[PDB]
Amino acid sequence: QVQLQQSGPELVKPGVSVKISCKASGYSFTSFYIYWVKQRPGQGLEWIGWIFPGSTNTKYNEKFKGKATLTADTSSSTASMQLSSLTSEDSAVYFCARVDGYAMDYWGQGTSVTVSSAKTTAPSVYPLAPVCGDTTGSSVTLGCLVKGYFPEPVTLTWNSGSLSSGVHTFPAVLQSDLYTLSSSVTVTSSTWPSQSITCNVAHPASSTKVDKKIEPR
Amino acid sequence: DIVLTQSPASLAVSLGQRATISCRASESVDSYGNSFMNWYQQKPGQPPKLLIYRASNLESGIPARFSGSGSRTDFTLTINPVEADDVATYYCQQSNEDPFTFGSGTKLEIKRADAAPTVSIFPPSSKLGTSGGASVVCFLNNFYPKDINVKWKIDGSERQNGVLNSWTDQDSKDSTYSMSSTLTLTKDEYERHNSYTCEATHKTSTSPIVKSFNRNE
Fold first, then answer.
1. Which residues of B touch A186 (CB under 8 A)?
2. Can you name the residues that pair with B117 across neighbouring β-strands?
3. How many structural domains does chain A have?
4. SS3 category, A155
5. SS3 for chain B, per residue?
6. Is the CB of residue B70 less than 8 Å from the CB of residue B53?
């Protein structure tokens, strides 16, 4: 089972280098090429360079030559990319891809790097119960508000992941150097508030795991 | 280095119909004998998935309905028939020489029957008041098409300052859109006024769906 496991999200200050790791499992690490691809948010794909885990052999894109350096450790079977002095135009999603000539077969999740020079802030979770008044019926919606956090992302979960079918998770939009994001779950009136529906919110930078039960107001 | 352009930039195709995607090249990638053109499918939040390599040869696990063709500079990808889970941005990449370049992007979207949004208004939580904030949330779930405008009204008068909007990507099953709007206000501004209405105009009906709540309860 061929897999590529990339590291988590990254928040960096301008003028600081960063290493991005890509763990490979399910195949012989030293026999296949590994290509690296950059993705500017809301834009296309950019090839950075390839690395052959066997021995020191790399070819880079001329646009990335003096910025990206590729290394691979054979013992840990991990491909690593260092990006020197990150700017505003470097805040992107970086991918690692396994290539068997001449197409990229397997991919990693992609590490979201944001630069970004702001302070890391704690998220605030708020439960959204239906409008005041003892029920309405048929099928009622529930919401979860995550107000004022930095940086991306926030993983939203409903009841640990059991009721994840009628869920609308909304992409985060930046306002005054702060991110805001919401999620809504639509369920039948028979299963609420008879069945306890909880909001599970996780944030990596602040290291906060706030769990809030939605109770009628 | 080798410019790859994709036409059209965006196409709308009904469920079960044929979609044509072109990929023009600035240099002949088919050099040496065979075409070195690859095709990818990328859903939002996910890495690109290889569909067809060398214009003709499909990757194992990819259905036969995904068909690619072309030689020299002109290349085409077709999906027949299309399904609900085909909502993605498709890319063509080239090997050959010399720094590897991706295409230009062509977003696929599905046309279906027009749907009316189920509007749900949510008052600020009791924990928001303690922190000093007041955010009124309004969810518009499962509607077609994407074109929709949300207008906030406080005590009969429109408010445009502090409105945060976010639109979701097309559903992988329903092929519908969803939107959320929030009035980022303070506790001081919230307690002065009483009525808060969430209004949305759509192509489905001339009358706007108005969902409102009173603080008086």
1. 118, 141
2. none
3. 2
4. strand
5. CCCEEEECCEEEEECCCCEEEEEEECCCCCHHHCCCEEEEEECCCCCCEEEEECCCEECCCCCCCEEEEEECCEEEEEECCCCHHHCCEEEEEECCCCCCECCCCEEEEEECCCECCEEEEECCCHHHHHHCEEEEEEEEEEEECCCCEEEEEECCEEECCCEEEEECCCCCCCCCEEEEEEEEEEHHHHCCCCEEEEEEECCCCCCCEEEEEECCC
6. no
The experimental resolution of this structure, in angstroms, equals: 15.6
| Residue B11 at interface with chain A, using a CB cutoff of 8 Å | no
| 8 Å CB contact of B95 and A102 | yes
Q: Which superfamily does CATH assign the domain made up of B4-111 to?
A: Immunoglobulins (2.60.40.10)
With contacts defined as CB-CB under 8 Å, which chain B residues touch A179?
none
Considering A114, A142, A163, which residue would you say is the last residue of a domain? A114
CATH number of the domain to which A104 belongs:
2.60.40.10
Report chain A's terminal Cα–Cα distance, integer Å.
49
Experimental method: cryo-EM
Q: Does B5 touch chain A (CB under 8 A)?
A: no
* Most B CBs within 10 Å, among A168, A183, A211, A217, to test the B interface: A168
B101/chain A closest Cα distance in angstroms? 6
Quick check: A184 and B180 CB within 8 A? yes
- A-proximal residues of B, 126-165, CB under 8 Å: 126-128, 131, 133, 135, 137, 139, 141, 164-165
Which residue in B115, B130, B126 sits closest to B178, CA to CA? B115
Q: Which of B139, B176, B217 to mutate to test the interface with A (most CBs of A within 10 A)?
A: B139
Residue A62, judged by CB atoms within 10 A of its CB (0-12, 13-18, 19+), counts as exposed
* A173–B165 CB contact, under 8 Å: yes
Half-sphere exposure of B78 (CA within 13 A, CB side): 11
The residues with which A99 forms a beta bridge, in sequence order, are A33, A104
